[PDB]
Structures are given as C-alpha cells and as structure tokens.
Design a protein around this nucleic acid. Sequence first.
RNA 1: CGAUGGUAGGAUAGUGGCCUACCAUGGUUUCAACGGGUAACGGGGAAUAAGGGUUCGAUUCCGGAGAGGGAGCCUGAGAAACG
RNA 2: AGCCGCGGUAAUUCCAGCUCCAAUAGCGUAUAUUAAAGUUGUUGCAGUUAAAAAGCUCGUAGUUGAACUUUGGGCCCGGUUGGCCGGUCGGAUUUCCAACGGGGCCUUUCCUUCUGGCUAACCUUGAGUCCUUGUGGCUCUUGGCGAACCAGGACUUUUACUUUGAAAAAAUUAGAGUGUUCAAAGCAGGCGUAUUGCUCGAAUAUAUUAGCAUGGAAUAAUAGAAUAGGACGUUUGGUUCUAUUUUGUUGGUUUCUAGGACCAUCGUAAUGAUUAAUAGGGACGGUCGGGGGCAUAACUACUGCGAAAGCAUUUGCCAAGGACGUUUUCAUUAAUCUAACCAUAAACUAUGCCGACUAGGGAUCGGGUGGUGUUUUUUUAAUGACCCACUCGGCACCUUACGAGAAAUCAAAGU
Lengths: 129, 62, 87, 150, 144, 70
Amino acid sequence: TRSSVLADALNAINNAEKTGKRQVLIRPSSKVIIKFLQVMQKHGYIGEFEYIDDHRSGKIVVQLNGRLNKCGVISPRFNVKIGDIEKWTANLLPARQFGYVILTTSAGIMDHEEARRKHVSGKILGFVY
Amino acid sequence: EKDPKRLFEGNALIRRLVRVGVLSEDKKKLDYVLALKVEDFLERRLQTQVYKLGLAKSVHHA
Amino acid sequence: MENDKGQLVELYVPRKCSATNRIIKADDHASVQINVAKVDEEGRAIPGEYVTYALSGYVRSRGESDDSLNRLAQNDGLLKNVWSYSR
Amino acid sequence: GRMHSAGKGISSSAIPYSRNAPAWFKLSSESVIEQIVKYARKGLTPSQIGVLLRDAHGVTQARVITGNKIMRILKSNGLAPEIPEDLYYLIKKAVSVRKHLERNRKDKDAKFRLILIESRIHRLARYYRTVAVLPPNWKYESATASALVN
Amino acid sequence: GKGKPRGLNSARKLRVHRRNNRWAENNYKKRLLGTAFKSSPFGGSSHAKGIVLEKLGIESKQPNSAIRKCVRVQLIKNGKKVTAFVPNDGCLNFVDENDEVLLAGFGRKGKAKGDIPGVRFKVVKVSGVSLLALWKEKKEKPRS
Amino acid sequence: VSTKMHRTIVIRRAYLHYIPKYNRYEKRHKNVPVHVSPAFRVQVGDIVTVGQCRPISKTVRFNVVKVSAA
RNA sequence: CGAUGGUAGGAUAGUGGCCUACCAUGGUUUCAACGGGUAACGGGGAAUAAGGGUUCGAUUCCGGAGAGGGAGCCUGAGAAACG
RNA sequence: AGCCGCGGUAAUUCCAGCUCCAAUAGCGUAUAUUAAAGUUGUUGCAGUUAAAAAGCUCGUAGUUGAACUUUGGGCCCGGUUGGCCGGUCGGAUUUCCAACGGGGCCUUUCCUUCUGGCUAACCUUGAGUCCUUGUGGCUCUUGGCGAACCAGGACUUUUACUUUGAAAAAAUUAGAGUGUUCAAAGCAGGCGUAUUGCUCGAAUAUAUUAGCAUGGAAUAAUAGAAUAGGACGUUUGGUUCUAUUUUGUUGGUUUCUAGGACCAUCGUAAUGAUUAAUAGGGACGGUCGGGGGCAUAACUACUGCGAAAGCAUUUGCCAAGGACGUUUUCAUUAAUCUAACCAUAAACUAUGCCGACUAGGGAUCGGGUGGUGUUUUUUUAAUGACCCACUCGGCACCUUACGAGAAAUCAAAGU
C-alpha cells in the first residue's frame, strides 16, 4: 500500500508531460514534496503551483512548461559521503554541464552544486533534468 | 580549479613536458596535453635529433 | 552553443513547436506550419503579412490540433468566444 | 481493500468542512451533554447514541458542538464499559457461530469462516494490550468465550 | 518491484540468497566440493608419467573414417589406467612398448559426430626424449 | 533481559553492521553479564549503564552504576 | 566427571571455578547456537581492473606454533628449552 | 589440426619444394584463475508461447509502513570573487558596484542556572589621571553589575547519519625533487681558488569497518501532564539530619544558626487530550446471490456466487458474506488447512500479491440519486412499472498504439 508519497508525486508529473499536458494534480501534499518542487522552480524546470487545503493533507496543482525530460526518486535514501557525490553524478545525469541531484542534508534540502560550496553532505533524495 | 592538488601536481607535469620539449611553449594549459600524440616523443630521440642537425645522411646512418 | 571566443558553433538551431514547446527535427514529416492573413481597414488582405503557427508531429496524431489552434489564435485576437479556459 | 476478502469498494460518510456549529442550532452545550448520559443509563454504546442523536435532535456531530468525543465524555462520568466496544462485538459474533457448531457437524465451510473471525481478534488484542487499555494478561479462549461476556 | 528487496536494513537476505543459488555456475561447484581429486585421473596436475601397456588402434565411425593410433598406459602415482594419443605417425610404424611416457591433455572439448572417439589425453615425450625431436629427427631413442 | 541469578543480571545490546558490496546494514546483538549491588533494585525491561572492573567471575567484568526505569 | 552464579579456604608473580567444600538452578539459540568439511597458520600485501567487483596470500617485515610422537622436570632474571 | 570441417586419384588445409605473413628472443603446447560475462545481475538479468510463480486461503521470526507541531519580516557588520579603476620610476586601488557564502541584533522566541574567585569593562561614595573645567571614561576609592578565565557545581530524554580533528609502523601503491652515459633502480647530489672550503635535500597524499574528540538539527526512530502523586511560588504548618564557625584551647552538654531531604493546605498561570487518509476495523438501514448445513432438464449465457476444488425441484429453519447508502464510532499494521489407481486431454511455465498514474467505445448485473418523459390507474401529479441521464462497484467483449515486444500479440505483457 501507499509507502512513499514523494515517489508517486513525481511519477504523476512526467507521466503527464510525456503526453504534453500543461498541468497536473497531486494528492497528498507533504513538507518534502514542496521543497523538492521549490528547487525545480528556482532553476526554471516548472512554472508555478498552488496548495489546496481540505483539512486532511492537501492537494497541489502544478504548471509545467516544456522543459522537463525526467524527474525521479531514489528509494532507499542511501548515505552519500562527501567524496562520493561525484560517483552518483556520473551515472544519473546525461551530461557534465547540466541537470541536478538533490540531497537531504543537515542544513536543508538542496541540490548538489549548492552543497559543494557550503561543504556539507547527507542522504540522497532524487534527481532532475 | 583553485584546488591545491591541481596546482601542485599540474604545474609540475606541464613543467616536465616542456623541459624536454614536447609541449609547445604557447600550449602551457592542462587541456592541451590531452591531445598529445605519439610521434611528439619520437622526434626527440637522439636517433632523430642527430639526423636533423646535419651529421648523418640518413636515419639509418644515425 | 558557443566556444570560448564567442561564436556559435552548431550547424543550425532548430524550430520549437508552439503548442507544447517540443523540438521539431529533420524527419518529423507531419510537422505542419500555418500562416494566416492580416486584414485591412477597408476589409481587404495585405498580400505580404502573416501570423505564423507551428504545430508538432504528435499534437496532430492524437487529434488535439484544432483545439490547440483555437487556444493559440484567440490569444492573438483572431477569434472571440469560441474557446474557454474553465472547461 | 478488505482484509480477509477480495473486495475493493469505498463508501463512507464524508465529513463536512466547517469545524464550527451550524447556524441552525439553538441550544447549549449543557443542554445536550446530558442527553448523552441520559441514554448511557439506558445502556447504549457510543455508536447507538450518535445516530440516535443525529436523526432526532439534529446534532450533526458531538465532536464539534461539545468540546470532546463521546467516549471521552463517558469516561469522565464513569459510565464507560469495561471491554472496548469493537472488541466485544467480535466476541459476540464469535459465539453465535460457535453455538451453531454444537448443532451442526457436516459443515466444512463455516468451520473455515470461524478461524477468520478469530484471527481478527488477536490482531485487535495485540494493539489494545500494547497501548495498555487491556491488562497484559488478557487472553481470549474457547473457555473464556463462555466466561467473560457469556 | 523487481521481486527482490530494496530497503536499507536488508543486507542479510541479499547476501544469503546469492551464495544459495551460486551453485548452478558449473565450475564453481567443481571448486568448492573439490571433485578434482576424487574423480580426475590426474588429481590436478599438468602432466603425468605412466608406463605403456600396449598398442591400440581406434577408428572414427560416422562421416569421417580413418585409422587413429592410440596407446594404453598406467600411471605411477595412481595405478589407474588411461588411453592416450600419439600424433601423426600416419605411416603406421612407431609401435613401442614397456616404455616410460609423459602425457598431457587436449585443450579439451570437441565434436565426435564423426566419432573421433572418447579419449582425453596425448603424449609429449617418451623415454627421456621429446616426440618432435624424433619426428623432425634431432635425436634418436636412447639405448645401449 | 534476565534477573534469575543471585546478584548478577544479563544485559542485551543492539547495533547494526554495514556490508559494503550491498551498501546496506544488518542487525546484530550481544549479551553481557554484569554484577548488581543490592543498593539498586532492577527488574526486567529497564535500561542501565555499567562500568568496567577487574575480573569478578569466569565471565564477568562490569557492574551497574546507574539505573533508569521502563 | 564445573556447566552459569553466591560464601569461605587452598594454590600462583598476581586477578579469576584455576582447584576443593557446602548451597542455589542457571547459562547459549532462526539476528543460525552446537556439530561436520577445509588439498585453512592470520595480517601488511598480490594479479586483473570505466565504475562496482572476482580470485590469491607456504614465501625477504611484524605476530603466533613446532623441533620423530605424547608426558615430566633441572639450572636460571627469564625455558615446561630439544646443536 | 581448439570448434564448422577438408579425405574417396589431379586436394585453392595431409606429405614435401618455392615464395609470402606474424611476432623476434617463440607466449609454441598443458593445467588453474581474471577480463570478455548484464552467462550471478547492489549498481544490473529472466514474467504467456523459449529453463523458470509453489493446489488454496488464515498466520512466525525477517523486511517495509499516510499527513501534521518556528515559519516569515526588518536592521547591521564583516569575507573573495565578476569588477570599474592603472594612477605604471603585472602590483598597488583612492573607490564603488553584481553575485556568492558568513556573522549580528529586534521582532510574544535559546544554554537552564549557581557560588566563588577572577580579569577587562559600565558604573556606585567620589576624586586621581590628564586632556575645554567633571561621579567624563581612562580608571582611584567604597559599591552595583554584565563582562573574559579557572574551580566547585547545578541540574538536564536517548540513538541512527553526516562535517572537521587527533591517533591507523616501515616496505610496497599514486606521487614531488634529482642526466644512474638513457632505462628498470637508487636516495642521492650541487658549487669555488680546489691551496686545509662553504651549501640544498631525504617532501606530500591514500578512515579503508570498530573506538575517541567536535560542528549541524534536514531525513527516520524514541520519551514527556488524563484517576493529574502535573509544573511554578520568597502560601504557610512540619519531620529530619550536618556542624563547618565562634564561648584561646581541650574534652563534657544545648542555644541558635546555616545547612539535607521528606510532610499537609494556600496561591497563578488562556492550566493540560494533532487531524479524521477517495488506509483499516466496528456498528446501522433497506436489498441481492445455482454460497453452506438440517428438514421436506430447457431458465444454464448474454451472464450469478464462493479462498480453492466447486455450486441447479419447491417450502421452512440455522448462521455466514460482498457491494451500495450515512453530517455514527475507535486512531489497527510476519508458525506456512468396488478400490488405490495406469497417464493411454502440446500434463498455457519468469502472476504479503497490495498501491499510484496513463486513450476510446458500446451491451449487460447489483445499489443509489435525479426527470415538465411514458403508460397499468388512483390520474397525462403519484403508488406502479417503464424510459432517459449521471453515479459508485462486478465477470466479460470490440477498437485503435503514443507505448512495449524476438514475434504472435498486450489497456497492461505500459510509465
């Protein structure tokens, strides 16, 4: 039964952008859904979104541009050290100059360039390109 | 870049290839060694540098 | 794409679609491109001016083409009251 | 999706949005909190109370008109039953099939609908023991079938 | 969900299934049970010396047909016996007997639909002298 | 986890262990026996802290120094 | 016929069921105990290698054991020693 | 002649001559192991017809488990980078900008404190000090303090993970310097007057489990007040236990005093209980079915029920069960239920099974809500049947295919 909420909150997106739609409807929301979304929004991959609430756990309605190829989740959230980001990043990402893998790290959820110049590390969460 | 192992082990590898004369003196950048070729060492042997400098009439007279 | 010096070094930049922002390659042989005619104050047509729409290969095959015309055209004032957002 | 079955339907009540009283309520919390205890002395469950309260005196939810739930009100006034209500109903259902078995023996079928009903009681009993509303020597048995309620 | 567990504290099922059905790789089972001693005529060696019982002539039945010359032998470290092969004295003129010989194996696996039949060994030297040194005639068999 | 002797008890400890090829963890445990002074009153299920002394019995090298209940 | 703990002695360079008296009934286990195989001395290390890994380590350094097979002791600060 | 094979004369391979090819000190043959091998699969394989999903449901250990509880706003200092600026007998930058990371305070809001020294610092009775003359600070004197450091504390849920440190022998491995005549090596060497000399080296990296020191508070666990023996009080009554001190000193007594805990009731705080999963269980109301037990064909597909094997005459009993309906209620998720036969049905097989999402089409079976539509008639309102439209649940069927596949084919065998 329903085990991960984020894992099918990103399966609902690219399943309805392979068919070229413009908006999707997510259910339920989460504190870690929104911050995964807020890092695909300061880089341009999605548009804007709204949070319903209905007193249980809200839904979300997202607006998609044209620019996502794939966004995903990595399901045992393993434990990335600090010398081992660049082996995760040479395998998941299509080329060396774009795309991002994001991490839950002791100073917030962030992408993998942003974690380099703050000099932190944590557990993996997903990717986006 | 600006990583102190790149700057100490880079500027020594570059410095050794010029000191024997394989890298060109305007190609002192680290990406330029990745397109080096195999006869750029073959043209520095004594068998080749004595024939070019006018001492033997052929490469088998070297 | 452009080098250290600055010049573009592709072969040649390709055409984005206009309904779904995809990219239309050199073997998308159903990729329609459609012009309409501007109008004159007397009610005639200028022979040289256009408004251009580019539609991809696969918004047509599913059948979602004409609605994507009415959505696209009505933003440019060509029509009025034939398409509606809140369906 | 229905443990111990294979059906998949969905039909519950849908709780309305507002967390306040309707504007067509003209009573007090004190003039309604005592009808709960006025029917507890009649020996009723919470389950029969609320459906009787809703269909007759128009209280949509005691949860919102008074500050508490039903069982919290009943526990504060000492009218609370001993065994928790849902667990008791699986017991009473379990004897009625058991009493059928002293009169029937050629039913290979409803033998294997009793090991299902009994299986849901150990599931219920682990939870009630762990949260400690049952004392940690509560056990069910066929002898304790005909002992504690019967 | 792939039919294998993915979660984080799952390393014990994963490593105990892998050595469980690692016993179908055909030459890992040969190495741990150690069947090289208990069944092989050599015991795990490159070469082996034996002493020749007698000349044999063997033939190859379906599509091929000719006259393959082999030799019986009895190993010194073991006492068991095998049938070797001697290469291309196709002239039929090098029978030799009660001699000391050195065997080896073929780089073995084959096709015996022409029925080049079931031997597994060869001969690399005899009585202290190589075979090719006699065929190319660089030595001759030592005797007094 | 057991208080059935005279002036000794048995402590259970629990950890995890990392297997590098499979990138994951597995659970393990070890029991230790310690000594209990009669100043403390320890029933099963509690959680103690213990410190090390010179060899007391065949198999004993710790004894309790604090206690906190269940 | 000491297996796990308590009390008092004996013995040792010294702690300790190390041994002896009286008493208690314990301790290990599907998170694999106990038993069987090993053509098994352990590690630093070695061969192959995109990444992950598979297979070796009798053998120049450090640690243990042995002197045909078992047991016993003398001299000494130190040996259950094998020139 | 490794394996496809070439022989039945003269062969575009055996046996020899000639001429060519490959490595040059042959890697020629044998036996082990590694890559090739996504043919051991964590990264990373295989579901119908090719090897391969157990007869069927309940249920151990093991693995895995919904959402929620401090966000935001404002001010200010100080980092190096893109820079303007070059000003020049590449380095200053007068000096400003963009970002990128870091402090700091304030907003209803973080160490929780105590006693001592103790040092700087504000200040207290108050001037020294010297500058426009000062309770000015600086600092002198008494006195309030925060303020840096030692020492006693004083109490306070506990982990997992991650960051930086100390400590992981040399040899070997990655590697800096260095004309062994080059090289593999070695740790040497270089310079002057060579005439009694000075002089640079022998680096650096490689937590790689467990333990130790330290920074952070995301992710995922865990504890706390519900019969209040709850928390704060300088409400008041108590019961104890220590004597450090002073009655020089000593020992012999008890008076306070401080100093430990426990003992009633008297006061103030807004006194203290997360939602109600298109998760699960439990009631409740009208129904449905060749479901089962006791007693007393046709309808059978177009489709009905059951965990499976299976299940057909009416009548009545006994209990069980799905779905629907609802502004009821509780706060859940894994030890392996005549007989016996011989296989004489291509004897269709890599389906915790639960969960989310992704195109159409009409028929039928249950439950519910609608409607100026019909008609038995009570009447063209309604009971009543129909009819129409929606709706949640069922076994099936026909289309296409973006997709998937070795293909046949498939709304999952797709993502």
